[PDB]
């Protein structure tokens, strides 16, 4: 039972997007967020640098932390970002909120899920 | 203390000299203007007007002032016993108003007029 009101909203919006528009990842991300927090993603930068690729939005079904280096000019979208994480990402690319992602890309196209 | 039990306790157990404040009644308009007080310890000489009981509206002379029970006897404010006798109906001074004072005591008159103290 998610107690955070905003996490609750995000999930309702992720769903609406997966249902209304063509998005099939949003509903997928929604399902992971509905699961226990321990199962949520805690991803460091070193892992985005290794697997992400330019012009393909990185979707993290959890939170991004600041360990390691990120050189790629990628748009990372996560539920939340650590202070250092967001600062490091914006230096080379762009850290975006999952709620922004949904508004801009409701069809959830050209997106790589990372955990 | 803010605790009800202690409050009621200090009132029901106050020593004689402290019980005077339990027999205080509000002064009339003129009396409030004249002595610069809102109330005063009702004396057995004072005249008073009942403002609350079944005797509300009545005027009378204070006949007795019991400190032990913190209650007073006013002239004509009575009850008829079964044998026909007429006995006083004790009144709480907070349900009464002083309309006239007994200033035969130089000490009370002095206290009433002084700005530093109050009677």
């Amino acid at each position: 039972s998610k107690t955070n009101p905003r996490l609750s909203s995000l999930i309702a919006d992720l769903k609406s997007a997966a249902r209304s528009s063509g998005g099939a990842v949003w509903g997928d991300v929604a399902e992971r967020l509905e699961k226990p927090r321990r199962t949520h993603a805690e991803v460091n930068l070193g892992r985005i640098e290794r697997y992400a690729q330019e012009d393909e939005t990185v979707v993290v079904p959890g939170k991004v932390l600041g360990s390691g280096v990120l050189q790629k000019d990628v748009t990372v979208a996560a539920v939340d970002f650590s202070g250092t994480a967001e600062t490091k990402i914006d230096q080379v690319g762009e850290a975006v909120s999952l709620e922004q992602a949904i508004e801009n890309n409701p069809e959830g196209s050209h997106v790589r899920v990372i955990r | 203390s803010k605790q009800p039990d202690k409050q009621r306790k200090s009132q029901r157990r106050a020593p004689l000299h402290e019980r005077h404040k339990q027999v205080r009644a509000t002064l009339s308009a003129d009396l409030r203007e004249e002595y610069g007080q809102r109330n005063v310890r009702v004396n057995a000489g004072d005249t008073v007007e009942v403002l609350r009981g079944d005797f509300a509206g009545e005027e009378g002379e204070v006949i007795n002032v019991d400190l032990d029970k913190a209650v007073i006897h006013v002239e004509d404010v009575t009850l008829e016993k079964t044998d026909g006798e007429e006995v006083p109906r004790p009144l709480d001074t907070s349900n009464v108003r002083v309309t006239d004072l007994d200033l035969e005591d130089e000490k009370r008159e002095a206290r009433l007029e002084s700005e530093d103290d109050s009677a």
Partner: protein
């Protein structure tokens, strides 16, 4: 954003930028947590006497007389929980920790969210406060801290169409239950919170339901009494600015 400053007559007197903290997203769950903690933290330890019901050499006769093996003293049962005048089995205990911990960050985040809830007119009205106004919180010139008469603060709140909240709070409820016997007979709505900088408003403090506070220490409770976000507040210009770095 911007906040219209008002002089002691209720007329506009310029305006300042409403600090960023008031943009902080409302987090009623975190707020309620901070409120729950602060309320628990002032609760006093209690518990029955360690030895109540144990002060007796009562013994059980055992089998033989057609009676249950219950400890008795002078033909009267004692000690055991099922016995009248017996010890309480699992009573309130003094040793118990009745305090709740809270991470400073988590609590500081709640203060900010509570602060922010103040800036939302719909929330404030939802919380229950009665007022006729669009902007909120109510910003006033620092010359408010110099007022003395309570009545003077009244005329000002009437000039701001915000006094109705005090008429909401001008009613004491005589509670149900025995708290009455413990000195908690009455209670009343929580109305306006006045936040200043140097010292709490001695002039406003006695207003029905009003709570006064200073910007350096205004907590989650006065900001969101009972854990409910959005209290109708009035900040003094300097306070408004000082509250920014909380």
């Amino acid at each position: 954003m911007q906040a219209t400053i008002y002089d002691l007559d209720g007329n506009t007197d310029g305006e300042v930028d409403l600090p960023d903290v008031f943009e902080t997203p409302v987090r009623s769950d975190l707020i309620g947590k901070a409120v729950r903690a602060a309320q628990a933290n002032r609760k006093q330890d209690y518990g029955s006497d360690e030895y109540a019901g144990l002060r007796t050499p009562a013994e059980s006769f055992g089998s033989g007389r057609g009676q249950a093996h219950v400890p008795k003293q002078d033909g009267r049962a004692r000690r055991v929980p099922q016995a009248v005048k017996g010890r309480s089995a699992h009573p309130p205990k003094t040793e118990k920790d009745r305090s709740l911990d809270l991470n400073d960050k988590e609590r500081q985040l709640a203060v900010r969210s509570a602060l922010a809830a103040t800036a939302d007119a719909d929330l404030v009205a939802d919380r229950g406060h009665e007022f006729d106004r669009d902007e909120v919180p109510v910003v006033v010139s620092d010359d408010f801290e110099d007022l003395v008469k309570t009545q003077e603060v009244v005329s000002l709140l009437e000039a701001l169409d915000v006094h109705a909240d005090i008429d909401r709070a001008d009613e004491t409820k005589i509670k149900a239950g025995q708290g009455s016997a413990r000195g908690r007979k009455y209670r009343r709505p929580a109305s306006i919170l006045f936040v200043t900088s140097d010292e709490p408003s001695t002039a406003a403090r006695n207003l029905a339901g009003a709570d006064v506070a200073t910007a350096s220490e205004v907590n989650t409770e006065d900001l969101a009494p009972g854990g409910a976000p959005g209290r109708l507040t009035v900040f003094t210009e300097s306070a408004l600015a000082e509250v920014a770095e909380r």
